[PDB]
Design a protein around this motif. Sequence first.
Motif, PDB file in Angstrom:
ATOM      1  N   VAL A 191      13.013 -36.657 -14.077  1.00  0.00           N
ATOM      2  CA  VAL A 191      14.373 -36.430 -13.634  1.00  0.00           C
ATOM      3  C   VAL A 191      15.262 -36.812 -14.807  1.00  0.00           C
ATOM      4  O   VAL A 191      14.857 -37.543 -15.702  1.00  0.00           O
ATOM      5  N   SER A 192      16.504 -36.345 -14.833  1.00  0.00           N
ATOM      6  CA  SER A 192      17.355 -36.561 -15.964  1.00  0.00           C
ATOM      7  C   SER A 192      17.871 -37.962 -16.015  1.00  0.00           C
ATOM      8  O   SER A 192      17.784 -38.683 -15.031  1.00  0.00           O
ATOM      9  N   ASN A 193      18.439 -38.328 -17.167  1.00  0.00           N
ATOM     10  CA  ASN A 193      19.080 -39.616 -17.310  1.00  0.00           C
ATOM     11  C   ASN A 193      20.516 -39.386 -17.769  1.00  0.00           C
ATOM     12  O   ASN A 193      20.747 -38.803 -18.834  1.00  0.00           O
ATOM     13  N   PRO A 194      21.516 -39.749 -16.936  1.00  0.00           N
ATOM     14  CA  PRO A 194      21.328 -40.219 -15.557  1.00  0.00           C
ATOM     15  C   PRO A 194      21.097 -39.150 -14.478  1.00  0.00           C
ATOM     16  O   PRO A 194      21.157 -37.949 -14.715  1.00  0.00           O
ATOM     17  N   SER A 195      20.764 -39.590 -13.261  1.00  0.00           N
ATOM     18  CA  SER A 195      20.620 -38.707 -12.097  1.00  0.00           C
ATOM     19  C   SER A 195      21.050 -39.428 -10.826  1.00  0.00           C
ATOM     20  O   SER A 195      21.363 -40.608 -10.891  1.00  0.00           O
ATOM     21  N   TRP A 196      21.153 -38.762  -9.674  1.00  0.00           N
ATOM     22  CA  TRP A 196      21.402 -39.389  -8.370  1.00  0.00           C
ATOM     23  C   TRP A 196      20.345 -40.488  -8.160  1.00  0.00           C
ATOM     24  O   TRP A 196      19.151 -40.170  -8.254  1.00  0.00           O
ATOM     25  N   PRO A 197      20.697 -41.765  -7.909  1.00  0.00           N
ATOM     26  CA  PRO A 197      19.758 -42.890  -7.835  1.00  0.00           C
ATOM     27  C   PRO A 197      18.626 -42.683  -6.848  1.00  0.00           C
ATOM     28  O   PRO A 197      17.520 -43.186  -7.035  1.00  0.00           O
ATOM     29  N   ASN A 198      18.889 -41.905  -5.792  1.00  0.00           N
ATOM     30  CA  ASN A 198      17.875 -41.729  -4.792  1.00  0.00           C
ATOM     31  C   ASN A 198      16.782 -40.737  -5.174  1.00  0.00           C
ATOM     32  O   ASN A 198      15.810 -40.593  -4.431  1.00  0.00           O
ATOM     33  N   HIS A 199      16.873 -40.046  -6.307  1.00  0.00           N
ATOM     34  CA  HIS A 199      15.778 -39.199  -6.731  1.00  0.00           C
ATOM     35  C   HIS A 199      14.498 -39.991  -7.030  1.00  0.00           C
ATOM     36  O   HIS A 199      13.424 -39.610  -6.584  1.00  0.00           O
ATOM     37  N   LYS A 200      14.601 -41.124  -7.733  1.00  0.00           N
ATOM     38  CA  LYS A 200      13.468 -41.967  -8.027  1.00  0.00           C
ATOM     39  C   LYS A 200      12.783 -42.428  -6.746  1.00  0.00           C
ATOM     40  O   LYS A 200      11.588 -42.243  -6.544  1.00  0.00           O
ATOM     41  N   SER A 201      13.585 -42.892  -5.805  1.00  0.00           N
ATOM     42  CA  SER A 201      13.080 -43.411  -4.552  1.00  0.00           C
ATOM     43  C   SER A 201      12.369 -42.396  -3.688  1.00  0.00           C
ATOM     44  O   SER A 201      11.318 -42.799  -3.194  1.00  0.00           O
ATOM     45  N   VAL A 202      12.813 -41.113  -3.504  1.00  0.00           N
ATOM     46  CA  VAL A 202      12.041 -40.258  -2.628  1.00  0.00           C
ATOM     47  C   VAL A 202      10.751 -39.835  -3.307  1.00  0.00           C
ATOM     48  O   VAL A 202       9.755 -39.654  -2.603  1.00  0.00           O
ATOM     49  N   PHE A 203      10.713 -39.695  -4.632  1.00  0.00           N
ATOM     50  CA  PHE A 203       9.476 -39.301  -5.299  1.00  0.00           C
ATOM     51  C   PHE A 203       8.498 -40.466  -5.343  1.00  0.00           C
ATOM     52  O   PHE A 203       7.306 -40.293  -5.094  1.00  0.00           O
ATOM     53  N   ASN A 204       9.020 -41.666  -5.577  1.00  0.00           N
ATOM     54  CA  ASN A 204       8.201 -42.836  -5.537  1.00  0.00           C
ATOM     55  C   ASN A 204       7.666 -43.053  -4.162  1.00  0.00           C
ATOM     56  O   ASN A 204       6.481 -43.349  -4.095  1.00  0.00           O
ATOM     57  N   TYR A 260      14.088 -37.750 -18.715  1.00  0.00           N
ATOM     58  CA  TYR A 260      14.476 -36.993 -19.879  1.00  0.00           C
ATOM     59  C   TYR A 260      15.945 -37.248 -20.171  1.00  0.00           C
ATOM     60  O   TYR A 260      16.760 -37.617 -19.316  1.00  0.00           O
ATOM     61  N   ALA A 261      16.281 -37.092 -21.447  1.00  0.00           N
ATOM     62  CA  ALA A 261      17.633 -37.359 -21.904  1.00  0.00           C
ATOM     63  C   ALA A 261      18.563 -36.269 -21.491  1.00  0.00           C
ATOM     64  O   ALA A 261      18.145 -35.127 -21.334  1.00  0.00           O
ATOM     65  N   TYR A 262      19.834 -36.583 -21.322  1.00  0.00           N
ATOM     66  CA  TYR A 262      20.733 -35.549 -20.865  1.00  0.00           C
ATOM     67  C   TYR A 262      22.141 -35.727 -21.396  1.00  0.00           C
ATOM     68  O   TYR A 262      22.761 -34.808 -21.904  1.00  0.00           O
ATOM     69  N   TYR A 263      22.671 -36.917 -21.200  1.00  0.00           N
ATOM     70  CA  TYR A 263      24.056 -37.163 -21.490  1.00  0.00           C
ATOM     71  C   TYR A 263      24.270 -37.783 -22.868  1.00  0.00           C
ATOM     72  O   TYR A 263      23.463 -38.556 -23.375  1.00  0.00           O
ATOM     73  N   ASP A 264      25.431 -37.464 -23.443  1.00  0.00           N
ATOM     74  CA  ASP A 264      25.876 -37.963 -24.732  1.00  0.00           C
ATOM     75  C   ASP A 264      27.014 -38.942 -24.461  1.00  0.00           C
ATOM     76  O   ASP A 264      28.130 -38.516 -24.208  1.00  0.00           O
ATOM     77  N   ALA A 265      26.766 -40.254 -24.475  1.00  0.00           N
ATOM     78  CA  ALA A 265      27.746 -41.300 -24.152  1.00  0.00           C
ATOM     79  C   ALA A 265      28.963 -41.383 -25.037  1.00  0.00           C
ATOM     80  O   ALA A 265      30.050 -41.826 -24.643  1.00  0.00           O
ATOM     81  N   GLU A 266      28.689 -40.919 -26.259  1.00  0.00           N
ATOM     82  CA  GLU A 266      29.658 -40.891 -27.326  1.00  0.00           C
ATOM     83  C   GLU A 266      30.526 -39.664 -27.153  1.00  0.00           C
ATOM     84  O   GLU A 266      31.732 -39.781 -26.945  1.00  0.00           O
ATOM     85  N   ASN A 267      29.920 -38.476 -27.174  1.00  0.00           N
ATOM     86  CA  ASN A 267      30.671 -37.226 -27.073  1.00  0.00           C
ATOM     87  C   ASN A 267      31.009 -36.685 -25.701  1.00  0.00           C
ATOM     88  O   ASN A 267      31.806 -35.757 -25.611  1.00  0.00           O
TER      89      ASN A 267
END
Lengths: 396, 396
Positions: B125-138, B147-154
């Motif tokens: 799942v992407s980083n970041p993502s809806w927090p509950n994605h980890k929990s239903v798959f787990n 996987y990387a997604y967001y650019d904190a700087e830009n």
Amino acid sequence: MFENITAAPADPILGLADLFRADERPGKINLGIGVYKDETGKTPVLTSVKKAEQYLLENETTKNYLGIDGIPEFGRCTQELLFGKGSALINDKRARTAQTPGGTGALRVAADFLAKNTSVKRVWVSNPSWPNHKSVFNSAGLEVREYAYYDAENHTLDFDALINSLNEAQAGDVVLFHGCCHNPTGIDPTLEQWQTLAQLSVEKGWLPLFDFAYQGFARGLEEDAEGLRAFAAMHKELIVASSYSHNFGLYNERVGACTLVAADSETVDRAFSQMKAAIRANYSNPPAHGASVVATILSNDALRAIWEQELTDMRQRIQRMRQLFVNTLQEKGANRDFSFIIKQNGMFSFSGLTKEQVLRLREEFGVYAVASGRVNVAGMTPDNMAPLCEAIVAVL
Amino acid sequence: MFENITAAPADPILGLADLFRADERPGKINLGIGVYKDETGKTPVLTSVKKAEQYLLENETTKNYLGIDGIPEFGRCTQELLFGKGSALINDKRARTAQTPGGTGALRVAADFLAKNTSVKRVWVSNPSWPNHKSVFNSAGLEVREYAYYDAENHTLDFDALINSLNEAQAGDVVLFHGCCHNPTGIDPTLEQWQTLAQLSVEKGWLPLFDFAYQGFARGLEEDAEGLRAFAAMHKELIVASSYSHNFGLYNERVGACTLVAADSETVDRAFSQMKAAIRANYSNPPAHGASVVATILSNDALRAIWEQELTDMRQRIQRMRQLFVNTLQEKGANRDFSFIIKQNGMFSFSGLTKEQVLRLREEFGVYAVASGRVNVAGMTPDNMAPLCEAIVAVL
Ligand SMILES: Cc1ncc(COP(=O)(O)O)c(CN)c1O
Ligand SMILES: Cc1ncc(COP(=O)(O)O)c(CN)c1O
């Protein structure tokens, strides 16, 4: 990825419906259904339910999410229905209820909570039981073991065999009890037998799980909970999965509850926070419509009065059909004593037929029953009673 | 049992809600909500939904069980919304849809299907993502990798870093894609990037899992499935989890769907039977009211016209607030450039505030936002825009 996924077998209750529909024979009868049906052959929306839906239509200002555990008064009301209005479990705040999608959903939530937060490795279910019991517990990664229950010879609860199979059955094992109207047998313990089982349960360290899908269908709302209530008096801990699918005719709105009781308040809150974390990772928060209907009926005394009558009439219709089934059988020439049918409770019974007599009635006659010989008495009407009975007298 | 169950940790999104109704000091703004609010600060029932609910009050004759996979029509309309009016996937019968309890319920049944019938051991799942994605798959027993997604700087989609992190993903891994309105980022791929991600997905052997919870809130209904449809054009197999919680305001009725596509119909029929077996062991069959409402509106051209207009106005309200927030930030004296807010889609954006700036915003008062910096732009109204912007300028 999916090329070599195998087919998944036909569901023993569901698969029969297709077979039926697709048969297009004239006066065919389906006793394989799992739903109440009235005298005309249909499954109506209760009047109390239609009145509570009118109310909601006019008063709902939002469809904003419910809390993970649902409607609060839905939970207060099912606690009073289960344990009685002055229960110490309620005054001492030892019980917590989450609203769930149906009784099956409550059973799965209980199973995911137990599997992830507890040492439970195994749950004991009666032989026989509703076949989807094994599948919800197995999906959560729990072993299901079977205890004896039924006497095929005498059409009774052979209590001695049940008690003997529940030996050893380790401390910290879960034992699942049907609260009233056993599916598939309709054979329930007596209050003396429930009290014995309760004593034996705390002696042995079992964790009782009541499945309560049919409250109100055997003897009455309060009478049907005496078994649960006899365990609740002696146990520190208990789980109850109930459904409002049958006693409210709300089958497709998915209305049920999972009640947790622990020795005290602080312990139920700590354990219920993990129950909620299990809900959140499954469906997140529960279906509002059906449960809103139940909380509106149960809390408005006019509506409740009307619901209780509607439920009484459904219970009396099933008792009429049980007397009329064995009477017509004795009249059309039935070879066997079928009086045990009148003893049994709710919509299900084992008719006492062979797998081959059950295929004889499907093929030859119009009659559809589950392979186990389980018939649903609510599928019988004063009108189809004589052709159904002629057809089973013919295969005896 | 239960004596030593540890408390579950507070849910990040839901934990803020109680802190909010406990503050009750005056002009509090809650931007940490997960629901659309209008200019009043209310979450209304759509009038198209009120109209369809009254039709159901007048026309339902039974509340008898839906099939395991739910209402047919609901499935067909979901597939046309997703894949488009004349897509080969629908004409070749490559797709099967199960009606589900919400978008979260679709994610969980895809997860149990995948964990039980397949060689999938991981989901990216992407980083970041809806927090509950980890929990239903787990909870299904699946490993989640990021996987990387967001650019904190830009404040952009770091495409090179996403392609690169995704090279660590093996064949037979499922990669999860938000179809549009990325939560929490609101940063979506261009169609040129979607097409890249599709081609790369075909040759590396990923199984695409699209989560489509906001179809219609960035651009429009069809424009939003443009990315889904580029994958559907080149993939043999894929899964789509969708929700009607947001574009229909049907949040607590739990309305969503899980669509399976396979190479051909007989393969998707064999795999869909295993999907239905997973539903049956979870909640047995789906809630009818909400999905009945969606199928009624979508089926009728008059109601569907009113709904499309209601969705348009929700989408245009979010877009106005995005604009008015960066303009009011400008004139209230913000020293940072917040232009990126205009570029992002749907209800969520990261504001670019530190953990300590959102804490002080909350304490030194008023404004509640997720610790992550996530703000729900639909919680801003023309009325609370200037005090909100006042407080944010005050902490930069
Ligand atoms: C014993 C038993 N437990 C649970 C259920 C499930 O109830 P629900 O229909 O709400 O899933 C049933 C079926 N009605 C049942 O017979
Ligand atoms: C990205 C994402 N996916 C799935 C869900 C769940 O949708 P639903 O509330 O219908 O379960 C959400 C929350 N609305 C979400 O943000």
